[PDB]
Amino acid sequence: CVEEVTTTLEETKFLTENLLLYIDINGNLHPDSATLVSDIDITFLKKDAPYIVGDVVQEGVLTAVVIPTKKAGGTTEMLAKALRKVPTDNYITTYPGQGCNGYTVEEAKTVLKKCKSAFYILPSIEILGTVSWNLREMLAHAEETRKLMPVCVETKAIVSTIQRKYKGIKIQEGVVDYGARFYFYTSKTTVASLINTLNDLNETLVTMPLGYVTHGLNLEEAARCMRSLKVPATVSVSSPDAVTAYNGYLTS
Ligand SMILES: [Li+]
């Protein structure tokens, strides 16, 4: 009932056209699902928001289910309960509950072995060492390695430091390659959208944990989100004790 495939989305459609996508209660796509809806109208996902966990929406070849997140009380049984609402069918999908939602692959496997449906699981397509580097250190590293450095534009202390270092830089949201290569973002976009952007750019990162403070996440919550990155990243945390903490959060 559950089979992992080695193929891309397009290379897996010969088995079924149906895609199972994961959304949150506002109808926003999980980063694992967000890359699967090219050239398809997805207005229907958010049109009927807000949802509750377990709600299912469908249009054409797409099915989407609202899954729980452990930051908001979610457990393994609530994940299983949510997936039971999906109509029985054959689907291409990803393992439910990964990334920010905080479930492990082994937990996702457990949920899907209930298998009213058949699922073909797309491949999740390298872990650089976690460090505790200050902003000056992170900038110098970026400059010489050409790694992409995400920066939250609302963090005034960082923006001013960059302006001093790189006289003449015009900081604006998006990629800015001046002195070093930056991805400037607002906390007024989702963490998922930022992760998908970084994954699409397909560059190695030097970064603080994404969502941590800027999007109200604690360190464990950010570490869960960081699992959705598909690019290598040097992750710089607040202190040496946080290195130990972060690495533990990432592996559970
Ligand atoms: Li973005």
Numbering used by the authors: 417 to 541, 548 to 674
How do the authors describe this structure?
Among all SARS-CoV-2 encoded proteins, the nonstructural protein 3 (nsp3) is the largest, and it participates in many essential steps in the virus life cycle. In addition to the CoV-conserved domains of nsp3, SARS-CoV-2 nsp3 harbors a “SARS-Unique Domain” (SUD), which was first identified in the SARS-CoV genome. SUD contains three subdomains; there are two macrodomains, Mac2 and Mac3, that are followed by a frataxin-like Domain Preceding Ubl2 and PL2pro (DPUP). SUD-core does not possess enzymatic activity; rather, it functions as a binding module for viral and host molecules.
We expressed a nsp3 fragment (residue 413–676) comprising SUD-N and SUD-M domains, denoted SARS-CoV-2 SUD-core. Although this fragment was highly soluble, it failed to crystalize despite considerable efforts. We reasoned that the lack of disulfide bond between SUD-N and SUD-M might confer high flexibility and prevented the crystallization. Therefore, we engineered a disulfide bond in SARS-CoV-2 SUD-core based on SARS-CoV SUD-core; the resulting mutant containing double mutations L516C-Y647C was denoted SARS-CoV-2 SUD-core-CC. To crystalize SARS-CoV-2 SUD-core-CC, we avoided using reducing reagents in latter stages of purification to promote disulfide bond formation. The protein was finally exchanged into an oxidative buffer and incubated overnight before crystallization screening. Initial SUD crystals diffracted to ~ 2.3 Å, and the crystals were gradually improved by optimizing crystallization conditions. SUD-core-CC comprises tandem SUD-N and SUD-M macrodomains connected by a flexible loop region. Both SUD-N and SUD-M adopt the typical ‘macro fold’, a mixed six-stranded β-plane is sandwiched by short α-helices and connecting loops on both sides. We clearly observed the engineered disulfide bond between L561C and Y647C, tethering SUD-N and SUD-M together. (2) We did not observe the SARS-CoV SUD-like dimers in the crystal structure of SARS-CoV-2 SUD-core-CC, and PISA software did not identify any other quaternary structures larger than monomers, consistent with the results of size-exclusion chromatography and analytical ultracentrifugation, demonstrating that the SARS-CoV-2 SUD-core formed monodispersed monomers in solution.
